[PDB]
Design a protein around this ligand. Structure first.
Ligand SMILES: CN(C)CC[C@H](CSc1ccccc1)Nc1ccc(S(=O)(=O)Nc2ncnc3cc(N4CCN(Cc5ccccc5-c5ccc(Cl)cc5)CC4)ccc23)cc1[N+](=O)[O-]
Ligand SMILES: [Cl-]
Length: 140
């Protein structure tokens, strides 16, 4: 479910760069999230490029980089926009790992994302009306 969302979004972002999720490894929610991600990545393309140009991805530091950035993202609280950005960050990390021929990290990044959602974001999501409320507020 959270798993489902992560795989959907990462598959989409990888496909946009011409990569397939399958080589490395509800619908309304997934579509609204895909679309919010596209829009976020445009509106904050500067923040996107700032991140991408400062990622030095290695197997030994990739979890550290994920954690560092995600802790910063939610330092001042959670909102729907920040959750979208969290997905877009996961997408950027996977694309970058494949660029650097560290495709092995893709399935691992997906797992880190699901764990973060399950352990840390779920309480907020549930308190704030669940994913249905996200669709209500930011779908179409
Ligand atoms: C057409 N209609 C139906 C939808 C269109 C709109 C606009 S489309 C959008 C999507 C997500 C976030 C913002 C805009 N939808 C929308 C609007 C407001 C809200 S909202 O809930 O009010 N929230 C926010 N509103 C405005 N701006 C925000 C800016 C935010 N940022 C700014 C950059 N910062 C960089 C950063 C900082 C720290 C750590 C990491 C990063 C980082 C860097 C690179 C990457 Cl790759 C990833 C992370 C990350 C946090 C966060 C929340 C924001 C939510 C949504 N919505 O969900 O669709
Ligand atoms: Cl907080």
């Amino acid at each position: 479910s959270n798993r489902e969302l992560v795989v959907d979004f990462l598959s989409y972002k990888l496909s946009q760069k011409g990569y397939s999720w399958s080589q490395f490894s509800s619908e309304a929610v997934k579509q609204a999230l895909r679309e919010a991600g596209d829009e976020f990545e445009l509106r904050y393309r500067r923040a996107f490029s700032d991140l991408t140009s400062q990622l030095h991805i290695t197997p030994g530091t990739a979890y550290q980089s994920f954690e560092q950035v995600v802790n910063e993202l939610f330092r001042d609280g959670v909102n729907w926009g920040r959750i979208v950005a969290f997905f877009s960050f996961g997408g950027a990390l996977c694309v970058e790992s494949v660029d650097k021929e560290m495709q092995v990290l893709v399935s691992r990044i997906a797992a880190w994302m699901a764990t973060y959602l399950n352990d840390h974001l779920e309480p907020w999501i549930q308190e704030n009306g669940g994913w249905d409320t996200f669709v209500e507020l930011y779908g179409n």
